[PDB]
Scaffold this active site. Sequence first.
Site, PDB file in Angstrom:
ATOM      1  N   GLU A  18       6.654  -0.684  18.780  1.00  0.00           N
ATOM      2  CA  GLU A  18       6.807  -0.971  17.596  1.00  0.00           C
ATOM      3  C   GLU A  18       7.386   0.355  16.897  1.00  0.00           C
ATOM      4  OE1 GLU A  18       4.498  -1.103  14.445  1.00  0.00           O
ATOM      5  OE2 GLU A  18       4.808  -2.937  13.654  1.00  0.00           O
ATOM      6  N   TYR A  65      11.171  -2.783   7.541  1.00  0.00           N
ATOM      7  CA  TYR A  65      11.029  -1.288   7.685  1.00  0.00           C
ATOM      8  C   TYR A  65      11.975  -0.552   8.282  1.00  0.00           C
ATOM      9  CZ  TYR A  65       6.237  -2.202   7.327  1.00  0.00           C
ATOM     10  OH  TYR A  65       5.014  -2.773   6.765  1.00  0.00           O
ATOM     11  N   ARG A  76     -13.885 -20.646   1.646  1.00  0.00           N
ATOM     12  CA  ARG A  76     -14.786 -21.647   2.253  1.00  0.00           C
ATOM     13  C   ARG A  76     -14.556 -21.627   3.648  1.00  0.00           C
ATOM     14  NH1 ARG A  76     -15.795 -25.682   2.037  1.00  0.00           N
ATOM     15  NH2 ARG A  76     -14.975 -27.689   1.200  1.00  0.00           N
ATOM     16  N   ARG A  93      -0.929  -0.372   1.129  1.00  0.00           N
ATOM     17  CA  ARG A  93      -1.055  -1.119  -0.236  1.00  0.00           C
ATOM     18  C   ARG A  93      -2.457  -2.089   0.212  1.00  0.00           C
ATOM     19  NH1 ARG A  93      -0.104  -5.799   0.617  1.00  0.00           N
ATOM     20  NH2 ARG A  93       1.734  -6.942   2.011  1.00  0.00           N
ATOM     21  N   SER A  94      -2.528  -2.329   1.566  1.00  0.00           N
ATOM     22  CA  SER A  94      -3.579  -3.536   1.939  1.00  0.00           C
ATOM     23  C   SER A  94      -3.762  -3.202   3.264  1.00  0.00           C
ATOM     24  CB  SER A  94      -2.901  -4.783   1.713  1.00  0.00           C
ATOM     25  OG  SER A  94      -3.905  -5.597   2.018  1.00  0.00           O
ATOM     26  N   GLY A  95      -4.965  -3.349   3.706  1.00  0.00           N
ATOM     27  CA  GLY A  95      -5.396  -3.041   5.259  1.00  0.00           C
ATOM     28  C   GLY A  95      -6.547  -3.524   5.633  1.00  0.00           C
ATOM     29  N   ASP A  96      -6.422  -4.353   6.828  1.00  0.00           N
ATOM     30  CA  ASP A  96      -7.911  -4.729   7.511  1.00  0.00           C
ATOM     31  C   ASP A  96      -8.357  -3.570   8.477  1.00  0.00           C
ATOM     32  OD1 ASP A  96      -9.621  -6.486   9.020  1.00  0.00           O
ATOM     33  OD2 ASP A  96      -7.997  -7.407  10.219  1.00  0.00           O
ATOM     34  N   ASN A 128      -2.402   1.179  12.307  1.00  0.00           N
ATOM     35  CA  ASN A 128      -1.470   2.048  11.511  1.00  0.00           C
ATOM     36  C   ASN A 128      -1.832   3.415  11.480  1.00  0.00           C
ATOM     37  OD1 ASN A 128      -1.255  -0.836   9.420  1.00  0.00           O
ATOM     38  ND2 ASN A 128       0.230   0.733   9.385  1.00  0.00           N
ATOM     39  N   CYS A 154       3.486  -3.124   4.346  1.00  0.00           N
ATOM     40  CA  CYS A 154       2.212  -3.101   4.136  1.00  0.00           C
ATOM     41  C   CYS A 154       2.084  -1.563   3.927  1.00  0.00           C
ATOM     42  CB  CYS A 154       1.344  -3.556   5.290  1.00  0.00           C
ATOM     43  SG  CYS A 154      -0.280  -4.199   4.635  1.00  0.00           S
ATOM     44  N   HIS A 155       2.531  -0.809   4.786  1.00  0.00           N
ATOM     45  CA  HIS A 155       2.698   0.533   4.624  1.00  0.00           C
ATOM     46  C   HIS A 155       3.812   0.990   4.008  1.00  0.00           C
ATOM     47  CE1 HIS A 155       4.846   0.659   8.727  1.00  0.00           C
ATOM     48  NE2 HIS A 155       4.004  -0.382   8.867  1.00  0.00           N
ATOM     49  N   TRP A 160       5.447  -9.259  16.023  1.00  0.00           N
ATOM     50  CA  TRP A 160       6.201  -9.679  15.078  1.00  0.00           C
ATOM     51  C   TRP A 160       6.905 -11.159  15.387  1.00  0.00           C
ATOM     52  CZ3 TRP A 160       7.953  -7.928  10.406  1.00  0.00           C
ATOM     53  CH2 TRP A 160       7.221  -6.756   9.965  1.00  0.00           C
ATOM     54  N   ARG A 187       8.829  16.943  -2.146  1.00  0.00           N
ATOM     55  CA  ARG A 187       9.461  15.586  -2.249  1.00  0.00           C
ATOM     56  C   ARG A 187       9.864  15.016  -0.939  1.00  0.00           C
ATOM     57  NH1 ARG A 187      13.832  18.742  -6.118  1.00  0.00           N
ATOM     58  NH2 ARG A 187      12.234  19.792  -7.438  1.00  0.00           N
ATOM     59  N   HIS A 222     -10.372  -3.384   3.182  1.00  0.00           N
ATOM     60  CA  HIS A 222     -10.970  -4.809   3.495  1.00  0.00           C
ATOM     61  C   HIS A 222     -11.596  -5.008   4.610  1.00  0.00           C
ATOM     62  CE1 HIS A 222      -7.066  -6.343   3.579  1.00  0.00           C
ATOM     63  NE2 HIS A 222      -7.467  -7.064   4.552  1.00  0.00           N
TER      64      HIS A 222
HETATM   65  O1  NOH Z   1       2.296  17.657 -12.397  1.00  0.00           O
HETATM   66  C1  NOH Z   1       3.360  17.247 -12.638  1.00  0.00           C
HETATM   67  N1  NOH Z   1       3.577  16.100 -13.191  1.00  0.00           N
HETATM   68  C2  NOH Z   1       4.674  15.472 -13.394  1.00  0.00           C
HETATM   69  N2  NOH Z   1       4.888  14.471 -13.858  1.00  0.00           N
HETATM   70  O2  NOH Z   1       5.680  14.085 -13.683  1.00  0.00           O
HETATM   71  C3  NOH Z   1       5.924  16.165 -13.048  1.00  0.00           C
HETATM   72  C4  NOH Z   1       5.638  17.465 -12.795  1.00  0.00           C
HETATM   73  N3  NOH Z   1       4.543  18.062 -12.394  1.00  0.00           N
HETATM   74  C5  NOH Z   1       4.564  19.347 -11.996  1.00  0.00           C
HETATM   75  C6  NOH Z   1       4.225  19.144 -10.354  1.00  0.00           C
HETATM   76  C7  NOH Z   1       4.773  20.310  -9.903  1.00  0.00           C
HETATM   77  O3  NOH Z   1       4.226  21.419 -10.556  1.00  0.00           O
HETATM   78  C8  NOH Z   1       6.089  20.327 -10.783  1.00  0.00           C
HETATM   79  C9  NOH Z   1       7.090  19.362  -9.955  1.00  0.00           C
HETATM   80  O4  NOH Z   1       7.785  20.476  -9.183  1.00  0.00           O
HETATM   81  P1  NOH Z   1       8.189  19.459  -7.840  1.00  0.00           P
HETATM   82  O5  NOH Z   1       7.113  18.688  -7.250  1.00  0.00           O
HETATM   83  O6  NOH Z   1       8.689  20.892  -6.958  1.00  0.00           O
HETATM   84  O7  NOH Z   1       9.377  18.844  -7.979  1.00  0.00           O
HETATM   85  O8  NOH Z   1       5.653  19.771 -11.877  1.00  0.00           O
HETATM   86  O1  NOH Z   2      -3.637  -4.274   7.705  1.00  0.00           O
HETATM   87  C1  NOH Z   2      -2.596  -4.581   8.056  1.00  0.00           C
HETATM   88  N1  NOH Z   2      -2.080  -3.804   8.556  1.00  0.00           N
HETATM   89  C2  NOH Z   2      -0.565  -4.049   8.544  1.00  0.00           C
HETATM   90  N2  NOH Z   2       0.450  -3.029   8.901  1.00  0.00           N
HETATM   91  O2  NOH Z   2       1.456  -3.590   9.641  1.00  0.00           O
HETATM   92  C3  NOH Z   2      -0.134  -5.227   7.926  1.00  0.00           C
HETATM   93  C4  NOH Z   2      -0.851  -6.152   7.701  1.00  0.00           C
HETATM   94  N3  NOH Z   2      -2.334  -5.950   7.659  1.00  0.00           N
HETATM   95  C5  NOH Z   2      -3.172  -6.944   7.006  1.00  0.00           C
HETATM   96  C6  NOH Z   2      -3.566  -6.333   5.642  1.00  0.00           C
HETATM   97  C7  NOH Z   2      -3.814  -7.743   5.181  1.00  0.00           C
HETATM   98  O3  NOH Z   2      -5.027  -8.259   5.417  1.00  0.00           O
HETATM   99  C8  NOH Z   2      -2.749  -8.510   5.625  1.00  0.00           C
HETATM  100  C9  NOH Z   2      -1.518  -8.812   4.928  1.00  0.00           C
HETATM  101  O4  NOH Z   2      -2.099  -8.159   3.463  1.00  0.00           O
HETATM  102  P1  NOH Z   2      -1.132  -9.293   2.398  1.00  0.00           P
HETATM  103  O5  NOH Z   2       0.289  -9.274   2.767  1.00  0.00           O
HETATM  104  O6  NOH Z   2      -1.834  -9.165   1.038  1.00  0.00           O
HETATM  105  O7  NOH Z   2      -1.564 -10.793   3.095  1.00  0.00           O
HETATM  106  O8  NOH Z   2      -2.519  -7.894   7.287  1.00  0.00           O
END
Ligand code: NOH
Ligand code: NOH
Lengths: 289, 289
Positions: free
Chosen positions: B66, B114, B28, B194-197, B205, B174-175, B88, B155, B235
């Site tokens: 920041e 963070y 509303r 996860r979420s963002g304006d 961001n 959020c990030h 902040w 990794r 969003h």
């Molecule tokens: O596709 C995959 N899905 C998994 N589920 O967990 C596990 C592994 N893999 C494949 C991705 C890469 O080919 C390999 C992982 O090796 P890495 O990303 O170098 O650790 O296994």
């Molecule tokens: O877009 C965002 N980027 C951020 N980076 O720092 C932080 C916040 N936001 C926006 C996304 C959401 O609209 C709100 C926070 O998401 P929520 O925690 O689910 O309320 O702020």
Amino acid sequence: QVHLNQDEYKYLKQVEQILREGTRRDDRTGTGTISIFGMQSKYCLRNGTIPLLTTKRVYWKGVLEELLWFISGSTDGKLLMEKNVKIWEKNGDRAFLDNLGFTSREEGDLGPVYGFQWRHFGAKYVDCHTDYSGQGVDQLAEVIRQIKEQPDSRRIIMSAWNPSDLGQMVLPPCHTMCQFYVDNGELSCQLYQRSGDMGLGVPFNLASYGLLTHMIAKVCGLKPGTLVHTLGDAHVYSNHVDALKIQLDREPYAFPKIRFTRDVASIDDFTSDMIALDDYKCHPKIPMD
Amino acid sequence: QVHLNQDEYKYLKQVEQILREGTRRDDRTGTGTISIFGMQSKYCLRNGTIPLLTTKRVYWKGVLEELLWFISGSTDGKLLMEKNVKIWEKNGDRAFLDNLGFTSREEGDLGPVYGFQWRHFGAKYVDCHTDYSGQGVDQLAEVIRQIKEQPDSRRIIMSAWNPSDLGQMVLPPCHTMCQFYVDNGELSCQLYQRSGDMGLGVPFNLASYGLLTHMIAKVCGLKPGTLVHTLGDAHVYSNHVDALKIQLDREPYAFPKIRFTRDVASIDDFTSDMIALDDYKCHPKIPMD
Ligand SMILES: O=c1nc(NO)ccn1[C@H]1C[C@H](O)[C@@H](COP(=O)(O)O)O1
Ligand SMILES: O=c1nc(NO)ccn1[C@H]1C[C@H](O)[C@@H](COP(=O)(O)O)O1
């Protein structure tokens, strides 16, 4: 556009594009890759549909067995093998353990891998026989709490990337975190995969997280929605181009459906015999790999 | 279909697709969103480029100050303020702390947000004037160690999602995490949000993680590559639609370029006065918001 299985047609495009426009990291150990960094796909989970690929068969029993065991919190690959699912077998036999320096460890102790993070993030890891209850943050329980109590939330995340624990693990996580989302009374999941093989793991991973969303929905009384699959390093082994080329030429069937054959008390109350996969219609098993 | 700035022309469509394909979650009281779950975007970072939007201006002094502050490991928003960056301020002043139950906490103790995660993951948090050197896992140091010693690693991941410390945090991350990837001696980054304006935070961001990649690259001796932007809840606020419709009209200018004016010893040795933004050319401020 005019495809029975449009969600799979799309995954086949993805492979096509990695082949078409990816970068090679070659070798002669026969382990060379072709890669796209950053990819995203969506699959529809509506009407009980689970995205198990039909153009190449997926190992449903391992997908099924391993996910129940993830949820159960377990880090003993011994329990998994009792069911004749051996996908974790090379990572837990004594030679792998000792080579990693894990020499005070019994066979099958994989360490604080996925189950342990999911249900006890931040607990102090001892072994696979330790009772860890009340210890660490149970992310799965909290995920269920949020869908039920706070559906609008944008912070429904469960994660297995614990930098504190990764050195004690037999492998690092590859499926690293996921986010649930509810809109319009349907439950959705976005999955982050750091790295995935598109002819083996990405397809198995896809099916694991679809099953999770179907399971988690039944528990929170929602209809399932969509799975978003985001890949970090989406790659192809270049010594299966021939196989992936055939597979790219097979028109997909429809995805199977999941049926839960009795009621569940919690997310801890599924089993092998109450999860039915109906009409998993598959192409013939592929020649080269 | 020749757009000088194609990567940002995409941003317009991204919004446009949320506008026309998105899911309403109305209220509303003037804060309603139109939302898409699951989105992905790529940006070129080559030859100095950094995705600071030209169609609506981004607060660079805030982006710059920041990000330098996150890296330092700091959790005192008073330091951030001393420089006249006020982003902040709302979450650190005392009405916020107490309404969260953080009543033994001084103004600006933001908790283990963070910077505490990025450089001491898993350390025990006490306050923002505490020395945590050697405590917890320094994930930024580890990210640099791998890019250099192990460029091929799949990794290279720094993540601020720590479930154990979440309840002590003034805001959830959020990030949530990022992956680094090297191909071709060029370094890219994939970000998970996860979420963002889409008109305030996703563009702030975008610039922050692009600047991070330029910074981390200069340090490892690599060329900047590509930034991948993934969102979960993407969003658009319902009240700002009139404004975004215009912004979608506007034609982007070429993205600005970053310049580093002296050498750096580590990722801990950047300062504001040596990061130069050249030619940030923008449209006029929006007549609506
Ligand atoms: O596709 C995959 N899905 C998994 N589920 O967990 C596990 C592994 N893999 C494949 C991705 C890469 O080919 C390999 C992982 O090796 P890495 O990303 O170098 O650790 O296994
Ligand atoms: O877009 C965002 N980027 C951020 N980076 O720092 C932080 C916040 N936001 C926006 C996304 C959401 O609209 C709100 C926070 O998401 P929520 O925690 O689910 O309320 O702020």
